[PDB]
Amino acid sequence: GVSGSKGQKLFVSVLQRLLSERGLHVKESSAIEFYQFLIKVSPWFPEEGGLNLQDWKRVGREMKRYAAEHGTDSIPKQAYPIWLQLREILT
Amino acid sequence: GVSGSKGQKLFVSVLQRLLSERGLHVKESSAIEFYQFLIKVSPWFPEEGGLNLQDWKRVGREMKRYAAEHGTDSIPKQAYPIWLQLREILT
Ligand SMILES: *C(=O)CCCCCCCCCCCCC
Ligand SMILES: *C(=O)CCCCCCCCCCCCC
């Protein structure tokens, strides 16, 4: 269950592994910010979610919902690009 | 939330991705049994650990100590095979 920085090291390490295999590298600081954004919008994801296209699509919808409510500038510039690359991996 | 299976779906999904790309397939129930064993012996791992050799070697030591103390029949048969394969994936 998420709470602050809990799970952050492991998430970042898995994310970096997945993206790097497609030739895309993310700074650790950017990957941390992405994690913090994800658990803010979709806290159910570590707890109840799977790394599968269905649940990842739900995360995407929830990220877009957040932008609709708080504005585009409110979300990390790397969030949609990282989300999209993981979506492609899951296809 | 007081679900007893927090994180289990995410774990099973990531484990099955990593193992399948090496040609190895684990029954869902077996992957769940492994997760429950992992968080029993090494509750710090999802919280603070990463998918790296130092952390995974530590989980390895802790699993072995559990076996020394409780006997090898108290441990899932698939636990050491799974741990070993993940050690190699990190190498
Ligand atoms: C709170 O939500 C608990 C979160 C537990 C997440 C399960 C851990 C996810 C691990 C996936 C990677 C496993 C690699 C060995
Ligand atoms: C998971 O199901 C979250 C449940 C959290 C329950 C909190 C209940 C707290 C009751 C005691 C409150 C005392 C302080 C006012």
Numbering used by the authors:
A (entry chain A), B (entry chain B): 2 to 92
Question: Which sentences did the original study use to describe this structure?
Answer:
Mouse mammary tumor virus (MMTV), a causative agent of mammary breast cancer and T cell lymphomas in mice, is a representative of the Betaretrovirus genus. The N-terminal domain of Gag, matrix (MA) protein, is responsible for Gag targeting and PM binding. Myristoylation of MA and the highly basic patch of amino acids located near its N-terminus mediate the interaction of Gag with the PM. Here, we investigated the role of myristoylation on oligomerization of MMTV MA and determined the crystal structure of myr(+) MMTV MA, which represents the first X-ray structure of a myr(+) retroviral MA protein.
